[PDB]
Amino acid sequence: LGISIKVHEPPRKIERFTLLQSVHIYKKHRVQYEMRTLYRCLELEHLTGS
Amino acid sequence: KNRAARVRVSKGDKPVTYEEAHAPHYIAHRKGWLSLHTGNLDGEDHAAERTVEDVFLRKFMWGTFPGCLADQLVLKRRGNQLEICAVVLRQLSPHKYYFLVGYSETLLSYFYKCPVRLHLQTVPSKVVYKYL
Amino acid sequence: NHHTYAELMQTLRFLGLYRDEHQDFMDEQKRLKKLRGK
Amino acid sequence: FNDKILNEPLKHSDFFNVKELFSVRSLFDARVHLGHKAGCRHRFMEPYIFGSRLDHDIIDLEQTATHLQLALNFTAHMAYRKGIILFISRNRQFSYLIENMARDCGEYAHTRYFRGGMLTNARLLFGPTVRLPDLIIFLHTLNNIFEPHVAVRDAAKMNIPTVGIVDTNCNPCLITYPVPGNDDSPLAVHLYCRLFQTAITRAKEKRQQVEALYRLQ
Amino acid sequence: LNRGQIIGEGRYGFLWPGLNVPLMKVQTIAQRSKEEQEKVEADMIQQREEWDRKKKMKVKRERGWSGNSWGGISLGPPDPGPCGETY
RNA sequence: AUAUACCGCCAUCUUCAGCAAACCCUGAUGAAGGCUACAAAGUAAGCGCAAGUACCCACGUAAAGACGUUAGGUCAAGGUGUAGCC
Ligand SMILES: [Mg+2]
Ligand SMILES: [Mg+2]
Ligand SMILES: [Mg+2]
Ligand SMILES: [Mg+2]
Ligand SMILES: [Mg+2]
Ligand SMILES: [Zn+2]
């Protein structure tokens, strides 16, 4: 559609959190989980409403 | 020893699929997630109520496709469109199979309040990645 | 709501469209407790 | 039906005329008759020994040569009847020579380390459909430490006949066709590979002319 | 131990058109009688006692030199080679 | 009530490298054992370590760590055997 376009990649925010490993005791043993959630910008420029 | 999602080696005669042969430190390293939705990205809400529906649909269909479900399902989610994909064994008659598509499609359409579409796949035997 | 989720699955065993293994595990085990118990 | 050319060369006596590739004189001049010390003789080289000279055991070359009309004849028949012939030694001083002689003829060599269970455990070491050798020819019946080979037992466990060079210290017992002769001498086994090579390739070309004669008649 | 049950039957007696009936020849739901599912319930439970007794069967095992003593009990002939050679 | 019936999730040696099905050999066909590359009977799938990935690299740190031991911890996360109350 001849649309003037650029792309850039915003830096990612990886929001890791921790949890206990056994069901009972042992706070010296954790397992930690993460979300890698990534980004993308689709910076279009100067296009009509239709 | 940590026993979170492994099956344990016993002999040479125990077959196992690709997924449950893989330990949970391979979740995005060697596996895919079994269900796709827009919940855990930040900051998005509706990550919370969906997964207590996500756990029903693989506890619903474990019972309504009984004895024939090959491995776990794939519960894709496209806007207001819940896309269940499933590979199922070739053991039942197909007249039964076509019954519980439209049974479960319009009973899961009228529970989630969305449309739901099923895509079955037929394999003759359970696909085994490891003779452990 | 946990009635909405758990009573619909009660009737869908009653009409037999959903065959669950946990409550099968009771009503066969409860069969073999009432033979002696109770 | 192809049993006309199998049941002639069992009735004929020295059918390949193998009594021309040696006598005692060819065996003397390549030092077959020398054996080791009387210190390390075996018990069962005792018939095959002429005597000791200043304690050096001397091997009966008459009792050698009455074996080799009979030992080279049998390994001719094994080449005639298309059976698998395995050459083994562990000499390390003729180990080039044995394998090179297996290419000069059309049969087999194995002169390297013996993997445990080569004949008694063949079916898992290889595929399940393997034709194991039908005669084994030894050129050193001893091993690189001086005890008899692994494949003198596993030949007899697998019920394979075996012609073997036995020298004054070797064990003649489980191997069916002993050849009481030298094996440590570089002139001796150049001779021994010369008679064993030529006695099978003559025996091969006997097998070629007979079936062709049967192909025409 | 799932063996007895068929995928359409529940003890509210509903004969669905796709399950539990011969295929389409009925395409109408059919709530049964109180007696016919009562007989199916005793068609069910009389079927379960048979595979209960067929579990509880005393096989006339042969007996080598005394019973519960793996003495001169036989086995079968040896299994063949992987390329023929029956025994 | 019983973690001494368990599943589930773990601790721990483990800041290890071994466990091993299926064969074969030695043992006079005894429990058993099986090593020497100038190689003397072992071969091997499978699991683990290793590799590879993640983080900022090959480094390091995580993550990983089989078989088993301590009848280790938990019926009170949730299921659930057996007994027990209604
Ligand atoms: Mg740990
Ligand atoms: Mg008795
Ligand atoms: Mg760690
Ligand atoms: Mg590693
Ligand atoms: Mg305790
Ligand atoms: Zn010698």
The structural class of chain C is mainly alpha
- State the total count of DSSP E strands of chain E: 0
β-strand amount of chain E:
under 5%
Distance between the termini of chain E: 38 Å
What class would the helix/strand composition of chain E place it in? mainly alpha
Radius of gyration of chain E: 24 Å
Largest sheet of chain E: none
The main pleated sheet of chain C reads as: none
Order of helices and strands of chain C: HHH
Shape of chain C: elongated
Order of helices and strands of chain E: H
| Helix residue percentage of chain C | 55-70%
Described by its quaternary structure, the protein is part of a larger assembly
Organism (chain E): Homo sapiens (Human)
Main location (chain E): mitochondrion
GO biological process, one term (chain E): mitochondrial translation
Family (chain E): Belongs to the universal ribosomal protein uS5 family.
List the helices and strands and how they pair.
This is part of a larger assembly, with chains A (50 residues), B (132 residues), C (38 residues), D (217 residues) and E (87 residues).
Chain A lengths: L4 E4 L8 E4 L9 E4 L7 E4 L6
Antiparallel strand pairs in A: 1-4, 2-3
Chain C lengths: L3 H11 L6 H9 L1 H4 L4
Chain D lengths: L3 H4 L16 H5 L20 E4 L4 E3 L1 H20 L4 E4 L6 H10 L3 E3 L11 H4 L9 E4 L14 H5 L4 E5 L10 E4 L5 H31 L1
Parallel strand pairs in D: 3-4, 3-5, 5-6, 6-7
Antiparallel strand pairs in D: 1-2
Helix pairs in contact in D: 3-7
Bound molecules: magnesium ion (5 copies) and zinc ion (ZN).
One magnesium ion binds next to loops of chain E.
Chain D binds one RNA strand of 86 nucleotides through helix 5 and helix 6.
PDB class: ribosome
Keywords: mitochondrial ribosome, ribosome stalling, cryo-EM, ribosome
Entry title: Structure of the human mitoribosome with A- P-and E-site mt-tRNAs
